[PDB]
Ligand binder design. Structure first.
Ligand SMILES: O=c1ccn([C@@H]2O[C@H](COP(=O)(O)OP(=O)(O)OP(=O)(O)O)[C@@H](O)[C@H]2O)c(=O)[nH]1
Ligand SMILES: Nc1ncnc2c1ncn2[C@@H]1O[C@H](CSCC[C@H](N)C(=O)O)[C@@H](O)[C@H]1O
Ligand code: SF4
Ligand SMILES: [Cl-]
Ligand SMILES: [Cl-]
Ligand SMILES: [Cl-]
Length: 290
């Protein structure tokens, strides 16, 4: 397995409380910046092309400077073709675009609804911000600072009937990921879990109904449970690969300890599904037309 596109969930801290969250606040561990950089260098030497920073909420650590420093390191020192972030968007300041936006290819913001009552039912924030305007503000900063803009949506019991066509098109993203809500034992299912996602789940038939309602959106990339569950390379906050084939998130040894080749043998990665879901795409902003 070559680690072509890898997600690094460097923190499990978060400031939201989405009821379905499948990457919960189980620890407060974050690698020292120098150790994270060492692990990223190991990934580059093993063939990394795209890194996505995630969590947790990645902008939390050191008030966004930890993430910015890693973004700049990957782009300028490792020369990675693609550096992306998935974020809930609650803590992103324009000063961060000024300091680090040059080095970021893609900013994904998670947006599950354009209805305030639904976001309250989900747990996305506390309703203090105008969340539609906040999203538009982040989008226009991506325009100003030449970052490609992406949206991620989790389709669940409370938004499965929503029509998002005009809202998504008003944001003109390069990529709109539409995930079926996914159950993960030890995260949002079972006795050992901080969340209980069962009440959020929808059937495959309901998820496809949502997809068909949004056919007109050209940037839509759909991922049913089957397309999502084993189609990612996921590094946790210790830089261990998480294996999701067992319906849990079982960890390998750290790449910092045993190296990439040994650790990744236990990832459970299904590369055919990674390709089938559209995981490989034009992901360098210099090669896009923003
Ligand atoms: O079973 C899973 C699957 C996915 N995830 C996590 O959900 C998030 C999905 O978020 P994205 O699909 O946007 O990640 P990405 O940037 O790698 O996607 P591409 O645009 O490159 O196709 C990623 O951070 C992934 O690690 C899990 O935590 N568990
Ligand atoms: N149970 C679940 N099923 C499918 N996607 C989920 C999920 N729980 C969370 N996600 C999605 O996984 C991605 C990474 S979650 C952590 C990143 C950041 N805090 C954020 O919310 O964007 C987000 O797009 C989130 O909406
Ligand atoms: S899905 Fe929600 S609770 Fe989970 S890490 Fe992202 S913003 Fe936080
Ligand atoms: Cl190299
Ligand atoms: Cl809020
Ligand atoms: Cl799908």
């Amino acid at each position: 397995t070559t680690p072509v596109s890898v997600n690094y969930h460097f923190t499990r801290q978060c400031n939201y409380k989405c009821g379905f969250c499948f990457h919960t606040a189980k620890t407060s561990f974050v690698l020292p910046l120098e150790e994270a950089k060492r692990g990223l260098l190991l990934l580059k030497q093993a063939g990394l092309e795209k890194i996505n920073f995630s969590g947790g909420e990645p902008f939390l650590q050191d008030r966004g400077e930890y993430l910015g420093k890693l973004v700049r390191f990957c782009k300028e020192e490792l020369a990675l073709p693609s550096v992306s972030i998935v974020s809930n968007g609650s803590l992103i300041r324009e000063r961060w675009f000024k300091d680090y936006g040059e080095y970021l290819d893609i900013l994904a913001i998670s947006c599950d609804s354009f209805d305030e009552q639904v976001n309250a039912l989900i747990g996305r924030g506390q309703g203090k911000k105008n969340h539609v305007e906040n999203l538009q503000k982040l989008r226009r900063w991506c325009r100003d600072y030449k970052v490609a803009f992406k949206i991620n949506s989790v389709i669940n019991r409370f938004n499965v009937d929503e029509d998002m066509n005009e809202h998504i098109k008003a944001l003109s993203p390069v990529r709109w990921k539409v995930f079926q809500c996914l159950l993960i034992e030890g995260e949002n299912s079972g006795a050992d879990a901080l969340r209980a996602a069962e009440r959020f789940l929808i059937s495959n038939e309901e998820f496809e109904t949502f997809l068909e309602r949004h056919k007109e959106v050209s940037c839509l990339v759909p991922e049913s449970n089957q397309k999502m569950k084993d189609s990612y390379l996921i590094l946790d906050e210790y830089m261990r690969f998480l294996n999701c084939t067992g319906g849990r998130k079982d960890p390998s040894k750290s790449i910092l300890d045993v190296g990439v080749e040994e650790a990744i043998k236990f990832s459970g990665f299904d590369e055919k599904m990674f390709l089938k879901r559209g995981g490989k795409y034009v992901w360098s902003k210099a090669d896009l037309k923003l």
